[PDB]
Design a protein around this ligand. Structure first.
Ligand SMILES: CCCCCCCCCCCCCCCCCC(=O)OC[C@H](CO[C@@H]1O[C@H](CO[C@H]2O[C@H](CO)[C@H](O)[C@H](O)[C@H]2O)[C@H](O)[C@H](O)[C@H]1O)OC(=O)CCCCCCCCCCCCCCCCC
Ligand code: CLA
Ligand code: CLA
Ligand code: CLA
Ligand SMILES: CCCCCCCCCCCCCCCCCC(=O)OC[C@H](CO[C@@H]1O[C@H](CO)[C@H](O)[C@H](O)[C@H]1O)OC(=O)CCCCCCCCCCCCCCCCC
Ligand SMILES: CCCCCCCCCCCCCCCCCC(=O)OC[C@H](CO[C@@H]1O[C@H](CO)[C@H](O)[C@H](O)[C@H]1O)OC(=O)CCCCCCCCCCCCCCCCC
Ligand SMILES: CCCCCCCCCCCCCCCC(=O)OC[C@H](CO[C@@H]1O[C@H](CS(=O)(=O)O)[C@@H](O)[C@H](O)[C@H]1O)OC(=O)CCCCCCCCCCCCCCC
Ligand SMILES: CCCCCCCCCCCCCCCC(=O)OC[C@H](COP(=O)(O)OC[C@@H](O)CO)OC(=O)CCCCCCCCCCCCCCC
Ligand SMILES: CCCCCCCCCCCCCCCC(=O)OC[C@H](COP(=O)(O)OC[C@@H](O)CO)OC(=O)CCCCCCCCCCCCCCC
Ligand SMILES: CC1=C(/C=C/C(C)=C/C=C/C(C)=C/C=C/C=C(C)/C=C/C=C(C)/C=C/C2=C(C)CCCC2(C)C)C(C)(C)CCC1
Ligand SMILES: CC1=C(/C=C/C(C)=C/C=C/C(C)=C/C=C/C=C(C)/C=C/C=C(C)/C=C/C2=C(C)CCCC2(C)C)C(C)(C)CCC1
Ligand SMILES: CCCCCCCS[C@@H]1O[C@H](CO)[C@@H](O)[C@H](O)[C@H]1O
Ligand SMILES: [Ca+2]
Ligand SMILES: [Fe+2]
Ligand SMILES: [Mg+2]
Lengths: 30, 34, 34, 37, 34, 80, 120, 64, 40, 37, 504, 341, 34
């Protein structure tokens, strides 16, 4: 149960990295 | 032309005057033997 | 202690050798501010 | 009722969402060992 | 391992409650008129 | 730009050095003598090299009493 | 474990290159907070009180977004005038060099205690 | 805005927003009370700290 | 009675009042001698 | 008044004085008190 | 829109909804108190105030109810160990119920004030703008606080109309709720004198009444109104936060050092009573007095109350816990059952030996035994090959006086060593470790947990003070500095006085 | 007009060293804290409080001098010069450790004065007071470590002593007795300090390597004017570089500089909370599940159990000289040691 | 009582996850342009 919890949180962070890079708000010059 | 005794003058000497006294003390210490 | 007068006599003569060489601007600049 | 003039809309932009989720998840990764003890 | 039996729910709610707070706020920002 | 005389003016002037060729060495020598006369030891209560221990006892004179601590260091010092 | 055994075997705390490392990261953290606070302190008013001030800067705008003369006027009076940077290029070079040099030296500390030249 | 029975009774208690006494007013008296209060806090701190030790005042569980 | 430490407390109180009083007396005097100049 | 002693000479002499006094302190690390001997 | 960390600023210009939010906060806090008390009553074992008092059981609000005179349950027990008591309505359960009902009523009032926010009372009569006259509100509230403070001291604490407060002997053996008369001499400022608590509330209350009247009747000086921005409710937030972090540091301090308002039968003993061997000294005094009166050693030690021996044990020291070692102290060493008696160690020559006690700093500690002059006579070695002081070499035995093991002597070295290991903790007790599946690792008491939370919150509220004081005094630049900021105001030499354009 | 306003005028004169109302608190307290440290490290022993030499006069060097804490028997005495311990005797006061509380307390009030200076100058110049707000982190550290920690312990003796090697001893004490590296509040402190140093380096390097060519010199510092309206470096190019290198990049300069304050300030505040816990010995010392397993299974070993053995060595080998008031005598057969060493 | 040790987190997530889904949808409906 503890191992599942640690790996789950880690996996969410890796997923977050993916969205934060490839699905970021695009920088736009105004 | 310029004033000579200022707040700056006081601040400079509150630090510089003991610093020289202390350096003379610590220089003397280098010659103390047990 | 006699050493107190031995230690401070240098500082005593230094403060006297610097007032007598700046006194024409110590009481002077004091009299200009008033 | 007459409307309250002090209401204001609230916002959380996408970068703030990502920053906040990172903070929470990393804080969880950090404190979880101590919660399990 | 003999871990704290509340550690799982403590960790789960520690993640979920503030994460959900942020998701609610983000989604209702996106749905505001552009 | 606050109205005081620039430091570069001051420390390149002969008058500055006339004064401070006297005052800086006087202070240095006074500090030297504060140590060389032994006065520093007595002002601050710092043991001289022969005054940390008595000849037979090899125990630290540690203060163990808060309100008569002053008198206790006096006793430890009379034991030298 | 690595840090504790390293201290036992090299007295790294008493090594001046690790002390430079500490000056590097304490100082880097200090200067990050200092620089962050001075720029933030002098942001030019572009928003109302119900907006994040961050919306007062637009990505790629040409005008600078804070008043460095105001920031220098503050910091130069906090210490004294000539202890404060008025040149942003000098300031940012200093921000780069201080932690980088400190970390170079602490890396060299580990890399030379690797050959058992140890702390004082 | 809505008037209520209770609100009308309380109205004079919330009617002087912004009203001030001229100049420094009672600031000097206030400073005296602040100074006395600083000395009071220093007294009770030093009693608790055993820096100030008073006859009949044993700061311990024993002899309460 | 006035214990030794109460006497000491009074000495510290008086010493602090003297430091503050002399400090402010000197600052007030200097501020009066060397006033800022303002246009009328 | 100011300027008669060039600033580069003041800097050189002052810097040399710093080296001398610090050098004296390093000498003392090897002699007398604190030398381990 | 508003960033997430500013959502509550919508209340700044809305006195009615600010009151509603304050009512809701108050409802939540009162609901917590009621909920916490019910949880504690559902878990508290009242059967043994000697070796299983509330502070061994992780009780946090129970001691606060007991401190002010709530000591009985509707089910018939009292926290001093009585049976068949009638507390009336104001039992622990009645207090909890009262807080739950109060919570519901505050919740309903919050709803009303949120809906009916636009009351004429909240509008300045001249401008029609929302406006609170904070200087006069302060006087009204200070007067009320003074009346309540005075009444608490003069009626409740004195027992004149109320129950009094918890008081005890210097060793926390016979604590109970008693009327307390005010102490009007200098010993009133002794933190350990309860009469000073009474005198404080009488005197500070009267001062609050007088100052409250002053603040109702006299307007602020213009110079202070302007300097402290007394038209801005955030100035009150700043100075109120400051007063609160001061009070929080004070209650953290008096909890850790002990005072008449943090008694050891409610919160447990202090770390300093272990540091100074406070209870060991009194135990030895009583034993020596018994011996001088002709008692035998078994009789002298059998006369020691188990409650007194239990305080002389490091498992009750609040500086022995851990930040993530959760729950009651009973979860660690166990539920204390009985004193085993006083262990006297002797070597083969018959000299009495003393186990060196563990200081609070040490998670672990060796077993070393000295004679009465501190000379080492035995120990438990780590390396054995050069051991000189082992219990086997020195013939160490242990005899017990008083408690369960009174009159018994052990000579088997493993058994003697096991008791020596317990003696580093002080007096030796039998524990039930099964009921709670106790893990044998020390935890702190409510004294420790209270002190930790309040020192931490106090330090955090220092930031809140700094933050809201800054917001108050710098409101004009909250969104940034003047876009046309005169470079002459920040460059040197233009103005004689920094930031004053009238100075050239 | 009015002596208060006249005094306010003089305090706020634009001069080489700004004074202000805050200066009345700051300058005497800062000068005395620094002067006390220089005085003690130059001339004052720790023989009677610690059994240690600690001054240049006794033979120490810059790394080993200190103004050491008072003896444990002093408790938390303010140790005022006129107090009941020293009774006005300056020499005895130094021997009792009075310079430690002198420096700690004047230092505390000087830090208050300094943060008031930050507020006062920000108000006079017209800037927002974020520099003062950031300085709350140094204050939180100083108060938690030099005041709250010893106040939770038995006496000032266990506060840090004011010296280089003395502070190193404090670090190793916290490892061996508190397992302070295991504490998640210290870990957040480390992340904020190293993260702040990282932000300092990367931002300074990024600005210096996205500069616009605003002059002809190969040395580029002269091509900046403090009064210029234009950014001196390209945020757009900097943003693309880091986006392509690291995956994300700043796009908002105001957020960037706030974040540079937030990270180290928050880290120091977190470390202070952990130290408040250690004032009460409320440590992150153990993982209970680790200990239950290791106690039952003598083949189970982790880096966590390895570090506790090191801690046990620290306590047994350092306590007799580090805690002289305890009069520890540990016969060498009881000292924990591995094989041979 | 010897209840299932996962009963608490099962019940908490059973409540939390679908309730949060609804709250997200509701709030972002309210924030849409009216
Ligand atoms: C952010 C702010 C910005 C910057 C601010 C900086 C301003 C600095 C100025 C403040 C200085 C504070 C000095 C406190 C001295 C102190 O405490 O000294 C301690 C004394 C108590 O004395 C101690 O008491 C102990 C317990 O004794 C008691 O118990 C013993 C054993 O049974 C005996 O019975 C004994 O007789 C009995 O008195 C021991 O005797 C100790 O040796 C003795 O030092 O209390 C006291 O003076 C007063 C205690 C109550 C008030 C405490 C408020 C301030 C401290 C808050 C932090 C608390 C720490 C909690 C840790 C977490
Ligand atoms: C002043 C607050 C306070 C204090 C001092 C206590 C004290 C106590 N409680 Mg009570 N309790 C409280 C409030 C408090 N409680 C509240 C608000 C609730 C509702 C949740 C409870 C519900 C409760 C229950 C159900 C129980 C207790 C119990 C206890 C006892 C054991 C405590 C323990 O193990 O803590 C452990 C403490 C910790 C592990 C510390 C947690 C530190 C956190 C996680 C740090 C978070 C850091 C943060 C994420 C950092 C952000 C960084 C970011 C800003 C960058 C102890 C007497 C127990 C008891 O014995 O009952 C009889 C018990 O069963 N309490
Ligand atoms: C009486 C206490 C008090 C009150 C009434 C306020 C009120 C306010 N604060 Mg201040 N503040 C305080 C103490 C207080 N503060 C303390 C102790 C700190 C240091 C921690 C601060 C640091 C602070 C900052 C840095 C800021 C404010 C801001 C504000 C304003 C917006 C608040 C908001 O919308 O948050 C919304 C909050 C959320 C949506 C969620 C917060 C979640 C927290 C972090 C985690 C869990 C909290 C938990 C439920 C709390 C239990 C509390 C209990 C233990 C005490 C509001 C005027 C803001 C401001 O000035 O706006 C202009 C702002 O930027 N406050
Ligand atoms: C602003 C500058 C400042 C501040 C904040 C401090 C603060 C401190 N000093 Mg330091 N000191 C200073 C400047 C300062 N000092 C200077 C310039 C010197 C060189 C002379 C010293 C030399 C010094 C020494 C040698 C020592 C200290 C010590 C101390 C500590 C104890 C002080 C004390 O108890 O005073 C108590 C006195 C006051 C608080 C004065 C208050 C006056 C009140 C407010 C007036 C009351 C009047 C009343 C209200 C009128 C009512 C009238 C009505 C009835 C009509 C404290 C940390 C002691 C220390 O650090 O020990 C470890 C110590 O031994 N100081
Ligand atoms: C106007 C401004 C005027 C200036 C005011 C300055 C005030 C602040 C000064 C702080 C100086 C602190 C260092 C003193 C060191 C010293 O005296 O050692 C004095 C010691 C004396 O040397 C010792 O003397 C003993 C005598 O019994 C024994 O002989 C010992 O063996 C011997 O080591 O010298 C050294 O240790 C040599 C190295 C000194 C190098 C110091 C490096 C400093 C590191 C940076 C820390 C920040 C300092 C910023 C200062 C600006
Ligand atoms: C919406 C609500 C959010 C839901 C909860 C979110 C997650 C909560 C995470 C908290 C973890 C708490 C410990 C987890 C382990 C555990 O099970 O504890 C469980 C403990 C109880 O402990 C249990 O007690 C039992 C008998 O009653 C048994 O003995 C169990 O073995 C024992 O674990 O619960 C608590 O004690 C929590 C309240 C403690 C409050 C202490 C106050 C100090 C806090 C100050 C922190 C300030 C930090 C500021 C930083 C900025
Ligand atoms: C026993 C306890 C002791 C506790 C200590 C209590 C006493 C100390 C309190 C603090 C006093 C600090 C004063 C320092 C300022 C100063 O001396 O300036 C020097 C001033 C200003 O000179 C002037 O200098 C001015 C510039 S500036 O103000 O110095 O920046 C300039 O405008 C002007 O023309 C020029 O004449 O000249 C004086 O008259 C000083 C009077 C003697 C002091
Ligand atoms: C310090 C860090 C090193 C900075 C490097 C020096 C600049 C190096 C530099 O750029 O040189 C230039 C600078 C100016 O020299 P000038 O000859 O032009 O002087 C002109 C000005 O004095 C006229 O206003 O020299 C100095 O400022 C030396 C000052 C030393 C400090 C003497 C005063 C100290 C008093 C105490 C200050 C307390 C501050 C209060 C804060 C609490
Ligand atoms: C070792 C030297 C490394 C120096 C750079 C550190 C790396 C930082 C990351 C890149 C940061 C970066 O991009 O820097 C850019 C910065 C300015 O670039 P310029 O192109 O204007 O000048 C460099 C060359 O092009 C020559 O003109 O470079 C310098 O200023 C060099 C400094 C002089 C070198 C003389 C020797 C200096 C040794 C002592 C260091 C003094 C530091 C003072 C403050 C503490
Ligand atoms: C309506 C109504 C009613 C009812 C009421 C009720 C039923 C109430 C309840 C209430 C309640 C029942 C409440 C509760 C509350 C609680 C709370 C408010 C809590 C909080 C908590 C917190 C905040 C925590 C925090 C934390 C954590 C979680 C972890 C550790 C750390 C800390 C401590 C921070 C009646 C019928 C009477 C009548 C009228 C109407
Ligand atoms: C405590 C006290 C007090 C006060 C005192 C004072 C205020 C003092 C001051 C003092 C001082 C003020 C001193 C000074 C000193 C200084 C010194 C001793 C210095 C040294 C330096 C050096 C050695 C340098 C080094 C270096 C560096 C740092 C870097 C660069 C390079 C080199 C290496 C050069 C009183 C009486 C109130 C009361 C009683 C107590
Ligand atoms: C030879 C080992 C057995 C001899 C008695 C051991 C000391 S006493 C022993 O200690 C345990 C730990 O505290 C307690 O849980 C238990 O109640 C108690 O009997
Ligand atoms: Ca078990
Ligand atoms: Fe920047
Ligand atoms: Mg030498």
């Amino acid at each position: 149960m503890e191992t599942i919890t640690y790996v789950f949180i880690f996996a969410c962070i890796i997923a977050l990295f993916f969205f934060a890079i490839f699905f970021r708000e695009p920088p736009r010059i105004t | 032309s310029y004033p000579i005794f200022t707040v700056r003058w006081v601040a400079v000497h509150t630090l510089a005057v003991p610093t020289i006294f202390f350096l003379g003390a610590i220089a003397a210490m280098q010659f103390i033997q047990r | 202690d006699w050493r107190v007068l031995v230690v401070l006599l240098p500082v005593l003569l230094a403060a006297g050798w610097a007032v007598r060489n700046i006194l024409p601007y110590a009481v002077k600049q004091v009299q200009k501010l008033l | 009722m007459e409307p309250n003039p002090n209401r204001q809309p609230v916002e959380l932009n996408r970068t703030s969402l990502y920053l906040g989720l990172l903070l929470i998840l990393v804080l969880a990764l950090l404190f979880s060992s101590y919660f399990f003890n | 391992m003999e871990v704290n039996q509340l550690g799982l729910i403590a960790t789960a709610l520690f993640v979920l409650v503030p994460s959900v707070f942020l998701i609610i706020l983000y989604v209702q920002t996106e749905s505001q008129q552009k | 730009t606050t109205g005081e005389r620039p430091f570069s003016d001051i420390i390149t002037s002969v008058r500055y050095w006339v004064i401070h060729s006297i005052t800086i060495p006087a202070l240095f020598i006074a500090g030297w003598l504060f140590v060389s006369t032994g006065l520093a030891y007595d002002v601050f209560g710092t043991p001289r090299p022969d005054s940390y221990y008595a000849q037979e006892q090899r125990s630290i004179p540690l203060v163990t009493d808060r309100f008569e601590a002053k008198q206790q260091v006096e006793t430890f010092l009379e034991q030298l | 474990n690595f840090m504790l055994v390293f201290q036992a075997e090299h007295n790294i705390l008493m090594h001046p290159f690790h002390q430079l490392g500490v000056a590097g990261v304490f100082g880097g953290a200090l200067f990050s907070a200092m620089h962050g606070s001075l720029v933030t302190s002098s942001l030019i008013r572009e928003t109302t009180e119900t907006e994040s001030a961050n919306y007062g800067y637009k990505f790629g705008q040409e005008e600078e977004t804070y008043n460095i003369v105001a920031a220098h006027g503050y910091f130069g009076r906090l210490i004294f005038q000539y202890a404060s940077f008025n040149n942003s290029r000098a300031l940012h070079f200093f921000l780069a060099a201080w932690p980088v040099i400190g970390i170079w030296f602490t890396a060299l500390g580990i890399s030379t205690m690797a050959f058992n030249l140890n702390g004082f | 805005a809505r008037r209520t029975w209770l609100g009308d009774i309380l109205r004079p208690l919330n009617s002087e927003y912004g009203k001030v006494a001229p100049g420094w007013g009672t600031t000097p008296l206030m400073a005296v009370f602040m100074g006395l209060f600083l000395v009071f806090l220093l007294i009770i701190l030093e009693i608790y700290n055993s820096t100030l030790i008073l006859d009949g005042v044993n700061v311990s569980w024993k002899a309460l | 009675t006035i214990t030794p430490s109460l006497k000491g407390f009074f000495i510290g109180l008086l010493s602090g009042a003297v430091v503050l009083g002399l400090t402010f007396a000197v600052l007030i005097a200097i501020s009066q001698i060397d006033k800022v100049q303002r246009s009328l | 008044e100011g300027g008669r002693i060039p600033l580069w000479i003041v800097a050189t002499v002052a810097g040399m004085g710093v080296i001398v006094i610090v050098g004296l302190f390093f000498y003392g690390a090897y002699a007398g008190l604190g030398s381990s001997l | 829109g508003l960033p997430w960390y500013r959502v509550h600023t919508v209340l700044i210009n809305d006195p009615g909804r600010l009151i509603a939010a304050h009512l809701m906060h108050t409802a939540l806090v009162a609901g917590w108190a009621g909920s916490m008390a019910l949880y504690e009553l559902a878990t508290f074992d009242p059967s043994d105030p000697v070796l299983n008092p509330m502070w061994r059981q992780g009780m946090f609000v129970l001691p606060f109810m007991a401190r002010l005179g709530v000591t009985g349950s509707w089910s018939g027990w009292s926290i001093t160990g009585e049976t068949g008591i009638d507390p009336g309505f104001w039992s622990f359960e009645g207090v909890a119920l009262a807080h739950i009902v109060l919570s519901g009523l505050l919740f309903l009032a919050a709803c009303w004030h949120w809906v009916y926010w636009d009351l004429e009372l909240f509008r300045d009569p001249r401008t029609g703008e929302p406006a609170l006259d904070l200087p006069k509100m302060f006087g009204i509230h200070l007067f009320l606080a003074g009346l309540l403070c005075f009444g608490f001291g003069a009626f409740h604490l004195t027992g004149l109309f109320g129950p009094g407060m918890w008081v005890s002997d210097p060793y926390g053996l016979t604590g109970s709720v008693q009327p307390v008369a005010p102490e009007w001499g200098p010993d009133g400022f002794n933190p350990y004198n309860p009469g000073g608590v009474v005198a404080h509330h009488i005197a500070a209350g009267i001062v609050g009444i007088i100052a409250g009247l002053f603040h109702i009747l006299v307007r602020p000086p213009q110079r202070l109104y302007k300097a402290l921005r007394m038209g801005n409710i955030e100035t009150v937030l700043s100075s109120s936060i400051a007063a609160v972090f001061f009070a929080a540091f004070v209650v953290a301090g008096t909890m850790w050092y002990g005072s008449a308002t943090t008694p050891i039968e409610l919160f447990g003993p202090t770390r300093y009573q272990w540091d100074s061997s406070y209870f060991q000294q009194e135990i030895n005094r009583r034993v020596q007095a018994s011996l001088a009166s002709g008692a035998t050693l078994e009789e002298a030690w059998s006369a020691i109350p188990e409650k007194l021996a239990f305080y002389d044990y490091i498992g009750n020291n609040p500086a022995k816990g851990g930040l993530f070692r959760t729950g009651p102290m009973n979860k660690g060493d166990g539920i204390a059952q009985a004193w085993k008696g006083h262990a006297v160690f002797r070597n083969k020559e018959g000299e009495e030996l003393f186990v060196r006690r563990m200081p609070a700093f040490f998670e672990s500690f060796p077993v070393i035994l000295t004679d009465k002059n501190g000379v080492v006579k035995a120990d438990i070695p780590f390396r054995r090959a050069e051991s000189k002081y082992s219990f086997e070499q020195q013939g160490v035995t242990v005899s017990f006086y008083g408690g369960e093991l009174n009159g018994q002597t052990f000579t088997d070295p493993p058994t003697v060593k096991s008791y020596a290991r317990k003696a580093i903790f002080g007096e030796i007790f039998e524990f039930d470790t099964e009921t709670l599946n106790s893990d044998g690792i020390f935890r702190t008491s409510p004294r420790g947990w209270f002190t930790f939370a309040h020192a931490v919150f106090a330090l955090l509220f220092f930031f809140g003070h700094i933050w809201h004081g800054a917001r108050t005094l710098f409101r004009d630049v909250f969104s940034g500095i003047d876009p046309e900021l005169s470079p002459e105001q920040v460059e040197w030499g233009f103005y004689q006085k920094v930031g004053d354009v009238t100075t050239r | 007009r009015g002596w208060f306003d006249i005094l306010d005028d003089w305090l706020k004169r634009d001069r080489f060293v700004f004074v202000g109302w805050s200066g009345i608190l700051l300058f005497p307290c800062a000068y005395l804290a620094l002067g006390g440290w220089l005085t003690g490290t130059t001339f004052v022993t720790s023989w009677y409080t610690h059994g240690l030499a600690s001054s240049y006069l006794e033979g120490c060097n810059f790394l080993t001098v200190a103004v050491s804490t008072p003896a444990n028997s002093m408790g938390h005495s303010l140790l005022l010069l006129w107090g009941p311990e020293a009774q006005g005797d300056f020499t005895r006061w130094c021997q009792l450790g009075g310079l430690w509380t002198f420096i700690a307390l004047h230092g505390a009030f000087g830090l208050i004065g300094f943060m008031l200076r930050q507020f006062e100058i920000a108000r006079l110049v017209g800037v927002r007071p974020y520099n003062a707000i950031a300085f709350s982190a140094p204050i939180a550290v100083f108060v938690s470590v030099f005041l709250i920690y010893p106040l939770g312990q038995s006496s000032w003796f266990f506060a840090p002593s004011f010296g280089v090697a003395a502070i190193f001893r404090f670090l190793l004490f916290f490892q061996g007795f508190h397992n302070w590296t295991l504490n998640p509040f210290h870990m957040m402190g480390v992340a904020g300090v190293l993260g702040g140093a990282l932000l300092c380096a990367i931002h300074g390097a990024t600005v210096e390597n996205t500069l616009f060519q605003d002059g002809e010199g190969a040395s580029t510092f002269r091509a900046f004017n403090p009064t210029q309206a234009e950014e001196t470096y390209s945020m757009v190019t900097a943003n693309r570089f880091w986006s392509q290198i690291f995956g994300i990049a700043f796009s908002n300069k105001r957020w960037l500089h706030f974040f540079m304050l937030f990270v180290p300030v928050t880290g120091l505040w977190m470390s202070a909370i952990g130290v408040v816990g250690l004032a009460l010995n409320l440590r992150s010392y153990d993982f209970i599940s680790q200990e239950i397993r290791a106690a039952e299974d003598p083949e189970f070993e982790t880096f966590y159990t390895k570090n506790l053995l090191l801690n046990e060595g620290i306590r047994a080998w350092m306590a007799p000289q580090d805690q002289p008031h305890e009069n520890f005598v540990f016969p060498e057969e009881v000292l924990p040691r591995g094989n041979a060493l």
